[PDB]
Ligand binder design. Structure first.
Ligand SMILES: *[C@@H]1O[C@H](CO[C@@H]2O[C@@H](C)[C@@H](O)[C@@H](O)[C@@H]2O)[C@@H](O)[C@H](O[C@@H]2O[C@@H](C)[C@@H](O)[C@@H](O)[C@@H]2O)[C@H]1NC(C)=O
Length: 93
């Protein structure tokens, strides 16, 4: 895979961690915070030849102590699925 040009390692994850707290993670609030964090990067996340998506999820889950697939599962439970409000789709993994 190509090296993701977005520096996920050093981004600010507080929009997610402040709104999405466990162990009873609120599904709608968690999905919304994840979309708010990740939807600006659909261009890079949806580059299937890059490691952007796997890198992003690795840091979300590391910094927030979240189970892998949590946000993918929660958003797929929601009315909008993994769709960003501007129309693009976030990858599940
Ligand atoms: C990351 O952003 C933090 C602010 O996030 C916003 O405000 C909070 C209250 C919440 O609403 C969130 O959704 C918003 O995006 C910011 O506070 C934090 O900075 C760190 O803490 C502050 C108090 C300073 O000490 C600063 O030096 C710290 O870095 C941001 N974190 C980083 C690592 O930049």
């Amino acid at each position: 895979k190509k090296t993701c040009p977005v520096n996920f390692e050093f981004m600010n994850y507080t929009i997610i961690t402040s709104k999405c707290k466990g162990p009873k993670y609120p599904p709608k609030e968690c999905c919304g915070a994840f979309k708010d964090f990740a939807c600006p990067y659909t261009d890079q996340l949806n580059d299937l030849s890059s490691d952007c998506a796997t890198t992003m999820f690795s840091y979300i889950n590391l910094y927030g102590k979240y189970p892998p697939g949590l946000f993918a599962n929660q958003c797929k439970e929601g009315k909008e699925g993994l769709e960003c409000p501007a129309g693009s789709q976030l990858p599940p993994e």
